[PDB]
Amino acid sequence: TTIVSVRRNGQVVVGGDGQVSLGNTVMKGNARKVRRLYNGKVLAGFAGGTADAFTLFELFERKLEMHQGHLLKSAVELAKDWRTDRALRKLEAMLIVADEKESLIITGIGDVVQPEEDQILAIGSGGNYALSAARALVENTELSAHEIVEKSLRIAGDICVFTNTNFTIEELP
Amino acid sequence: TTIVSVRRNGQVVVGGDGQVSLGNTVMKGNARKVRRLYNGKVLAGFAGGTADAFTLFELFERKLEMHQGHLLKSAVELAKDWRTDRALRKLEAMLIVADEKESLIITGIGDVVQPEEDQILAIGSGGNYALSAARALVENTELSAHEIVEKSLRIAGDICVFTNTNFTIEELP
Amino acid sequence: SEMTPREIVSELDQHIIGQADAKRAVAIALRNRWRRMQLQEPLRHEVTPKNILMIGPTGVGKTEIARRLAKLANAPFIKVEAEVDSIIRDLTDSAMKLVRQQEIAKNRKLINPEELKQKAIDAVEQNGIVFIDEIDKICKKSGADVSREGVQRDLLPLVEGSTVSTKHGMVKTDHILFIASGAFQVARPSDLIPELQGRLPIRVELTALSAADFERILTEPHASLTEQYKALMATEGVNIAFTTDAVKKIAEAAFRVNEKTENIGARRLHTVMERLMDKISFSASDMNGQTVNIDAAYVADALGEVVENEDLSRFIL
Amino acid sequence: SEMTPREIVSELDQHIIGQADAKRAVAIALRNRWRRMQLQEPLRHEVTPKNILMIGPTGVGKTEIARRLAKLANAPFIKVEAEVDSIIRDLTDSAMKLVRQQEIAKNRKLINPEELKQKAIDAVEQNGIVFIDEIDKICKKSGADVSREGVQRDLLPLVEGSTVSTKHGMVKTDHILFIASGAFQVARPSDLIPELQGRLPIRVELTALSAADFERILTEPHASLTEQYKALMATEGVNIAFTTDAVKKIAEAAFRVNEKTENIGARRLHTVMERLMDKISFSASDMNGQTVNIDAAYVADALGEVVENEDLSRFIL
Amino acid sequence: SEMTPREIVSELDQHIIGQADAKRAVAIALRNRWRRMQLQEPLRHEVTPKNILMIGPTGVGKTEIARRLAKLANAPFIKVEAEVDSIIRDLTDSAMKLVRQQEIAKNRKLINPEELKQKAIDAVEQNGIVFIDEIDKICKKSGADVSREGVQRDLLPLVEGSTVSTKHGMVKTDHILFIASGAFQVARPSDLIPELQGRLPIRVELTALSAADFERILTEPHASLTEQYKALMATEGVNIAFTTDAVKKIAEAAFRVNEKTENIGARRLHTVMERLMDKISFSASDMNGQTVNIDAAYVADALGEVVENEDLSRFIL
Ligand SMILES: Nc1ncnc2c1ncn2[C@@H]1O[C@H](COP(=O)(O)OP(=O)(O)OP(=O)(O)O)[C@@H](O)[C@H]1O
Ligand SMILES: Nc1ncnc2c1ncn2[C@@H]1O[C@H](COP(=O)(O)OP(=O)(O)OP(=O)(O)O)[C@@H](O)[C@H]1O
Ligand SMILES: Nc1ncnc2c1ncn2[C@@H]1O[C@H](COP(=O)(O)OP(=O)(O)OP(=O)(O)O)[C@@H](O)[C@H]1O
Description:
This is part of a larger assembly, with 2 copies of chain A and 3 copies of chain C. Chain A is α+β, with helices and mostly antiparallel strands. Chain A is built from 4 helices and 11 strands. In chain A, α3 runs antiparallel to α4 (145-157). The longest helix of chain A is centred in the N-terminal third of the chain and has 15 residues, at 50-64. The two termini of chain A are 25 Å apart. By secondary structure, chain C is α/β, with parallel strands linked by helices. Chain C has 2 domains: 1-97 and 121-206, P-loop containing nucleotide triphosphate hydrolases (Rossmann fold), CATH 3.40.50.300; 209-314, Helicase, Ruva Protein, domain 3. Chain C has helices at residues 5-12, 21-34, 42-45, 64-67, 89-92, 113-116, 121-124, 148-154, 156-160, 211-216, 225-232, 248-251, 267-276, 278-282, 296-303, 311-314; strands at residues 52-55, 77-81, 129-133, 163-166, 169-172, 177-182, 202-205, 239-242, 291-294. A 5-stranded parallel beta sheet of chain C has the order 2-3-6-1-7, covered by helices on one side. A two-stranded antiparallel sheet of chain C has the order 4-5. In chain C, α1 (5-12) packs across α2 (21-34). Chains in contact: A-B, A-C, A-D, B-C, B-D, B-E, C-D, D-E. Chain C binds chain D through residues 58-59, 79, 81, 90, 93-94, 96-97, 134, 222-223, 227-228, 231-233, 235-236, 261-265, 267-268, 270-271, 273-275, 281-283, 285-286, and chain D through 4-6, 24, 27-28, 31-32, 35-36, 38-39, 42-43, 46-47, 50, 153, 156-157, 162-163, 165, 170, 190, 194-195, 197-199, 201-202. One adenosine-5'-triphosphate (ATP) binds next to loops of chain D. The PDB classes it as chaperone/hydrolase.
């Protein structure tokens, strides 16, 4: 997939295309890759092959609706469930989560990563393509975090063979 | 990563760059690789891929704040948790720990290693490059253990493609 | 010989301020267990109480409304959180205080225990409030074993109607009124065995307590913290004033802590007050006959500040 | 009819030297369970004691301050470290030897074992101190199972308020005063179920014992080791002098051992003294009528030295 | 009214030859539980016995010195190897046959049920020796579970001071004297919870029994094997001579077996003698009135030889 998140002017946007790839064939091309969590309080975009990609999603929910939607704490509570003696399996996927306050990237291996000063996050095969266009824009244009995510996603759909121009974007507030 | 530790004149320094590598791409370049433990009594630098690299860090903490910060004992207490009948998983990472008294290197496989006479320690891909510059300096210059760690880290960032010039250094006392 | 719902509500609005639909559904639960009395034989021995399920946070008043309806309606009460038949054997041992304290100063020798063994039972079987706190803690998903669904199974003959054998005789349960509470944040009501979802028709959802709601709970309720400390410190010979601009800074200062840590609910007020009435409670005796004014200036510099832990900088790269 | 906090503190400063905020919070815990007496009916049957949570090392005085407040205030005491209701059935069995130890040596016949069934209960429901040592040992993380959070759940009806059925009758708990201790080095107070964090408002943190603190604990406390040996050796007909320059070399010699091995706390003094009073304790009888001067020179060459084990050279490459 | 350490030692040197520091530390353990008597009220109800920890092989005399100090000092004894409170309920049932046997054989009717439940408990709470054999068998490492550290936890209220409820009343333990033994070859004393290392100040290390030490244990001790067989065979009407050059070949022949198999200790002598006194014990009656000389020549060709198993040639390549 290609999942990107830009944050500019009290705006937090999270976009992603909609191509479910099986081998070198396309099975589904509309798939919603960015979903809403905690009654619409947090944004989550996933990447990494359906199954694991999903169970990682659910596990972060059962942690939000058990910590009052405190993103950072929910994140770490989940990460710590991998860094123990008795591991929590291992997931082939990662998430980009963000609410009005913070934005993160959580991997199903048990680690939480904070963005770099510019507050831009991308994941998936088309990841760095979007991250390159995003940084390009954020640093050289006035465009809104939505316009940028929109623009950056397309630039990445035209380079990655596993990413299309059929995306779903969500923003906060 | 490149993590190096020099000890000269009652000084114990521990530095490391800040590049989180994913494949041959760079995901985060500011990351703090050297953290403080036991209220600031001990220094710890890690290397070996986030997750494991972290859970190894935590496990050494739960052992310091359970042995009065006795580095050596905490180390061995941790190592012994791998050398038993029922293993403690296996971690793809290693730590360089040091307080005013001693300095060590602990691997998530269950072994503790003491420096060689010069008291210099390095780990990570950029490891030996720093260790080579360190020994070079320690044995031929008057530079402080901080200056040396600083200098050695840069020499290693310019040769290792997984090491940058964006580092974080900590010293004791 | 019992109150009206309109009155049960208004009598509850004095110890448990807030909520609403909460009391309402609880009121009609008592009112209709009485209306069950004025009926013949057929339409009387068969009309199980419409049990209640309270869905709400922690510290919002799910247990209060069940307690202030055991005294302000007088009936055997008991709270349990998931043996099972020993829940009735305790509802009976708590009925020997409204028949041996209600008929010791009333019907006043007169001993005859074989006389109160059918005067105590007749009670429980009629007036019986069993409260199950944290019932959501026994649902199907829990990621390994499902024996918690066994407890939900042994706790079935009771909400249905069986005959528990206590040390006072065979006490039936068919007419007891059960009230179960739950956070239900992880699970949903429908995650309970269907053979027990239809034995809890009343679904009432309580809300959380806001800044303003914490302001009122601090005074309006009988024996509120403002009064309890006004009195416990009056015995020391000291008077204390709790200004209004200082009650806001205690409700909107115990709320600030519930949205940055676990939301323990109203019980947060107790731990806040205990830090406020810390300076006074100690040297109150050695300061006899003094009226201390606890205002915004005092409360402010009474506790300090409480920002989040350190989460980040500790374990995140 | 009870002391003032200022006095409870000063009466504790004789057996438990050190600490501070420790005693303070404990004092006001007793003082306000009494001030609860001089109150009407409403504001009296509802005002649960502000329970205490002592956070400190091992051997610093977390249990002492709970014991020297069970006698120096007289009330049923009991210590437990994680059945649960059998904690109350033991608080009652420790009530008889009070409401019948002094009373039996006061009523002299006049037995009447029927009043110690309602007057010995007032001795619990009112004066009741339950001490839970090592409570941090039952928190969520523990890396496999979480049944330790089940104990923290069965131990809830007590700190809240229920009716334990003992062999002396139905004794309520609502007003008992609970005090829990813990090292809390691995876990944090907030790692306890929220439905019990608000039932322990008082958070007192005790400090560890330094070199100077070990010097004082050796003499000042009543029945200190310096006195206990001065007396236990006087019965042999021998007198012994514990100079001050030799008390320093026993406190700063039992401390040197606590920072190089497990920190057992004050209890380290006992094992040190026993090695010092080893030469004398044996041949004390056969040396009747002698004043031995235990000074720096004696203490020094009395035990020897205690350097770390060998840790390194054994399992390290 | 009790012996002196110098005497307790010398009275032990007759059944348990060998050791040394063993007896010494055990002696002063008894001597100072008596010196505790001649003291006022403060410095008397608080002065816990300095418990002992015996570190030594198997069959060297760790249990003997604890037994020959329960009779040769007379006090309730009991040995246990890791319920926990039923260790006291057995120390009381062993304190009966010293009243309804002793106090009827000194001051011979005179029953009085309510007189033994005050004449016996006062004997346990004062004279009480609890022996814990193999305590090293409950330490942290064991390579899977650590519940053995739970036993070390339930066995804490006792060595500390609690009130065990027996069928004879509430017997305190605060003053009981505990002695724990252990091989401590795998673990170390410090592998025990620190909250119990300071409740065992006395550390005595017993040595193993050599060739010469096995020679003496064969005769010097009262009721030694040399005497026990001299008497058990005299009843058959037969006399037997145990020459000295033949005692060496029985001590240095039971030692040869302890250094080539499990080192069962002194108990090795019993299995050796039983093979020696095998020929005689059978046909002793049918050989009345005969003085048999058991010398080097007899002992030699009495048992045979005992070389190692085969270990090697079996499972090694
Ligand atoms: N609506 C309310 N008005 C006043 N006080 C309240 C209210 N709700 C809760 N409290 C306070 O909360 C405390 C009791 O908590 P309670 O047992 O009612 O919480 P719960 O949510 O029903 O239970 P749990 O936390 O076990 O789910 C008391 O101090 C009471 O004053
Ligand atoms: N402040 C103190 N002053 C003097 N003696 C002390 C003090 N604190 C503890 N002691 C000594 O410690 C022993 C009792 O230990 P205590 O029960 O106080 O431990 P604790 O601090 O409760 O720890 P834990 O409960 O974890 O063992 C007694 O010998 C007592 O004299
Ligand atoms: N020094 C000794 N002198 C005389 N008899 C001894 C001696 N040591 C052991 N024994 C004999 O050993 C037997 C008791 O052994 P004991 O219980 O003392 O062993 P231990 O050293 O305590 O080891 P464990 O407790 O591991 O068995 C008795 O038959 C006793 O006579």
